[PDB]
């Protein structure tokens, strides 16, 4: 008969005596106040795309997420991308403890949120003693009087409150109680169903001036970009802590699966990764001004091993020879073949060569009117499509209305993408951008002409970081 | 005849100006965004505030190549835990720097970023802002009052803070008249490359009391920080950090000192100790101890937090070889004191031979047992560290090599630090007391935050 939330809360009630004993030696009235404002960190406008990233090793819906749990290493990664860090403090269902909260508080500069099922002042005291700047209070668990009493306890220590609402009645209660941060949970915490539409619905009732946090179930940038317009912030956990490389997962979520292609130096790769790129492209084609030797290629990979490197070529065979330690994919940039059946054989030959640990991408010239047709036909035979102008490195666009809706979730958009047209490129709705000459130094830059322009990399990724559909 | 090192650097940089002008010729300078991070506000936390500007520097005139495998993004991630600012060398010919390094750091870190360049032309100020700087260095050793004011006015167009570098009384007077808000006292003479660590104390008598004073260069250890801290808002530290393989461990060692959290019995305690600032973690191998750790628990703690140097602690006089697993940095001989000095030296020699030359050897001495003090001085040269359980005429030799132990707690930490040992050995004073139920004797994460906050800004008076 008990729901998941009722089980969790009754479990937490049974922890209160242990928590009281754990901090019985602490002088609660002398506790230092929090000096980090989660409100001011999240209060950057609807569309501001602030992330609260969550340290979570396990959950009722997923089970064990991250067995080898280093909250301090996760917090260091989160300190690059996030505007707040959420730490599960609940032990029986989430693998959490107050030691995780303290580890995160000492590791990060960000405001730290104790994510707990709070029903008693002792949990507020514990939160502050172990380093929290904010607590979660849930209107699904607390009546108005219990909420005010715990909110007043939080106010004693300058703890911000994330006020969790799941419906129209909780929104009206939160307004009456003077909530400043509304947390809309997409997850129904009784039956664990997800409704991503819940934040759009409740944003109609939540005050225009209030901070709105969209929590739970956000797995990809397309969701971020759909929800961005009515959200100050996202709370995101398992999409990050389920991946071996948390820093790559954060970039893939916040920015998307974007490639900075034509890398020819170690420092360009480090700049691309710092800025937020997931993929680095290395060109293996004699005719290209961006061509790299085996020597450069290994120097770039060693200097910045946190990109996924794509070996790009126009060849139709010999992809085997482009492979080294760190190559995540090959991008077949050959001209369009005679038939769909020859594209499918070209792809299966390369997949044979590179083996099953190495992805196979296909560039399609959409400058051709046959491009759209090959794209839909080969979509299921490749890991990614590049939808490109001419035959690569042109720095020119094609008609972006030419991209079929079918393939977008598998596609990087390519061809003259620059800081000036980035917003318009993101609006096409492909999973990612392929970025090359549009962030290069132009022809008048002297010996720097054609090298990656670190200032152009800062601008385009800042544009990407807050893009949402209008 | 031969130009000084500073003269060669400045003239080399004059020869790069054509390359820089072309590199940013496509940039609309008038429309550059302003910096929104204040180095001034970050550093303006009082004399003794111990704010660090940590420097990304891969090479110097004085040291040659410091860090060949250079990842400014990974170093900035480490620095973002400890620092109140990040300095990035942009000078390419002697310091291995580039504006890409500046941009990588600006994109990686939340902190105000300082372009560390020899600035002589407005193009360098424009480039600094475009590649993400929040602050620039202007050197009164390089610029006359007119050159400085033209460059400081360019800087003010973009909300760039200025680190005004001064080396003598003449330069501080000029800096006051020019309206400088941040005084960078270089301990290093850039003509003869000599270091005078006493120069920040001397120029602090002439620098306005309400002004930010940054003590730059030559700071290698926490004893120097604690000595200079009283007259400093901040320290700028580079090669002590970038010359070490593990920059996070070197940052902790410099900011907090070589402190140990002993008697670790859980993975979360070790993670908390490392996050708080600890360099060493102690693991006890004694069946008598409530802090005794199994083989299995030992390997869980090390794997959960591999960024502490682990110290195997035992009362045994032999059998130190079968305490060694991967991650064991040191052994701590916690045997009851032997009959004489010679039996102590011989106990230590025998432990050296068991663990071999890759494993440090530490000796715990009880300072009550009055032969204790004599043994300490006798064996100091034969151990890598002492653990000392007077303090008026305990030699400076013994102090520099010692962790002070004896119920160190959040309440007495400042008094312990005033003794002047290199480090603190912290155990029961950060444990939950007997009334904590199942938590009795585990490490109190809240006590670790408090004691390390006190260490972080301790200076001598
Ligand atoms: O996540 C669950 O399975 C669950 C179950 C019952 C009660 C609460 C739950 N979630 C806790 C909540 O803090 C979520 O972890 C965050 O909102 C992050 O959601 P995520 O991005 O991992 O889907
Ligand atoms: O860029 C090159 O020189 C080159 C040469 C041969 C094959 C592919 C090449 N380009 C890699 C390709 O993914 C490019 O990143 C895209 O075509 C976008 O280039 P852009 O038009 O932005 O300069
Ligand atoms: O450090 C040098 O060798 C040198 C030589 C000539 C001119 C300037 C120099 N130093 C640049 C200066 O920014 C220093 O790197 C910082 O003050 C950090 O000093 P450190 O802590 O590395 O001794
Ligand atoms: O702590 C123990 O139980 C133990 C047991 C056997 C041998 C040595 C032990 N202690 C480790 C030692 O490094 C201690 O940190 C110091 O002696 C200081 O202990 P304190 O008095 O601060 O608890």
From Swiss-Prot, chain A:
One example of a Gene Ontology biological process annotation: L-tryptophan biosynthetic process
Reactions catalysed, as given in the entry: N-(5-phospho-beta-D-ribosyl)anthranilate = 1-(2-carboxyphenylamino)-1-deoxy-D-ribulose 5-phosphate; 1-(2-carboxyphenylamino)-1-deoxy-D-ribulose 5-phosphate + H(+) = (1S,2R)-1-C-(indol-3-yl)glycerol 3-phosphate + CO2 + H2O
Gene source species: Corynebacterium glutamicum (strain ATCC 13032 / DSM 20300 / JCM 1318 / BCRC 11384 / CCUG 27702 / LMG 3730 / NBRC 12168 / NCIMB 10025 / NRRL B-2784 / 534)
Residue numbers spanned by region N-(5'-phosphoribosyl)anthranilate isomerase: 258-469
Domain of life: Bacteria
Subunit structure: Monomer.
Record PANTHER family: INDOLE-3-GLYCEROL-PHOSPHATE SYNTHASE, TRYPTOPHAN BIOSYNTHESIS PROTEIN
Record GO terms (molecular function): indole-3-glycerol-phosphate synthase activity; phosphoribosylanthranilate isomerase activity
Name of the protein in its database record: Tryptophan biosynthesis protein TrpCF
UniProt similarity note: In the N-terminal section; belongs to the TrpC family. In the C-terminal section; belongs to the TrpF family.
Function of the molecule: Bifunctional enzyme that catalyzes two sequential steps of tryptophan biosynthetic pathway. The first reaction is catalyzed by the isomerase, coded by the TrpF domain; the second reaction is catalyzed by the synthase, coded by the TrpC domain.
EC number: 4.1.1.48, 5.3.1.24
Segments of this protein annotated with the region Indole-3-glycerol phosphate synthase: 1-257
Key words of the record: Amino-acid biosynthesis, Aromatic amino acid biosynthesis, Decarboxylase, Isomerase, Lyase, Multifunctional enzyme, Tryptophan biosynthesis
Pathway: Amino-acid biosynthesis; L-tryptophan biosynthesis; L-tryptophan from chorismate: step 3/5; Amino-acid biosynthesis; L-tryptophan biosynthesis; L-tryptophan from chorismate: step 4/5
Taxonomic lineage of the native organism: Bacteria, Bacillati, Actinomycetota, Actinomycetes, Mycobacteriales
């Amino acid at each position: 008969l008990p729901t998941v939330l009722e089980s969790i809360v009754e479990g937490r009630r049974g922890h209160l005596e242990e928590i009281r004993a754990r901090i019985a030696h602490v002088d609660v009235d002398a506790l230092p106040k929090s000096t980090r404002s989660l409100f001011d960190s999240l209060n950057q406008g609807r569309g501001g795309a602030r992330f609260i990233m969550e340290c979570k090793s396990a959950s009722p819906s997923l089970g064990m997420i991250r067995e080898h749990y280093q909250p301090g290493e996760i917090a260091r990664v989160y300190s690059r991308y996030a505007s707040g860090i959420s730490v599960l403090c609940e032990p029986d269902r989430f693998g959490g403890d107050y030691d995780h909260l303290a580890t995160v508080a000492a590791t990060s500069h960000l405001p730290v949120l104790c994510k707990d099922f709070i029903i008693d002042p002792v949990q507020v005291h514990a939160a502050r003693y172990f380093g929290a700047d904010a607590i979660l209070l849930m209107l699904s668990v607390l009546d108005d009087e219990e909420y005010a009493a715990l909110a007043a306890e939080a106010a004693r220590f300058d703890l911000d409150i994330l006020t969790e609402v799941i419906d129209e009645e909780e929104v009206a209660r939160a307004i009456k109680l003077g909530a400043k941060i509304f947390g809309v949970n997409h997850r129904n915490l009784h039956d664990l169903s997800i409704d991503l539409d819940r934040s759009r619905r409740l944003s109609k009732l939540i005050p225009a001036d209030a901070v709105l946090v969209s929590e739970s179930g956000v797995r990809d940038t397309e969701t971020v970009r759909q929800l961005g317009g009515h959200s100050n912030a996202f709370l995101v956990g398992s999409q990050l802590t389920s991946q071996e490389n948390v820093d790559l997962a954060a970039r893939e979520l916040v920015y998307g699966p974007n490639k900075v292609c034509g890398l020819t130096s170690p420092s360009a790769a480090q700049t691309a990764r710092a800025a937020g790129a997931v993929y680095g492209g290395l060109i293996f084609e004699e005719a290209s001004p961006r061509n790299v030797s085996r020597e450069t290629l290994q120097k770039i990979i060693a200097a910045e091993p946190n990109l996924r490197y794509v070996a790009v070529s126009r060849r139709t065979s010999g992809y085997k020879d482009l492979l080294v330690d760190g190559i995540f994919a090959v991008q077949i940039h050959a001209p369009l073949q005679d038939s769909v059946e020859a594209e499918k054989a070209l792809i299966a030959a390369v997949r044979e060569e590179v083996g099953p640990q190495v992805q196979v991408w296909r560039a399609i010239s959409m400058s051709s009117p046959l491009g759209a047709e090959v794209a839909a036909a080969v979509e299921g035979d490749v890991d990614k499509l590049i939808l490109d102008a001419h035959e690569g490195g042109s720095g020119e666009v094609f008609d972006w209305a030419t991209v079929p809706a079918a393939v977008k979730a598998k596609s990087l958009l390519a061809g003259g993408i620059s800081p000036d047209n980035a917003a318009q490129a993101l609006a096409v709705g492909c999973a990612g951008l392929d970025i090359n000459s549009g962030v290069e130094y132009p022809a008048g830059a002297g010996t720097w002409a054609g090298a990656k322009d670190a200032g152009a990399l800062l601008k385009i990724f800042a544009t990407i970081s807050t893009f949402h559909y209008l």
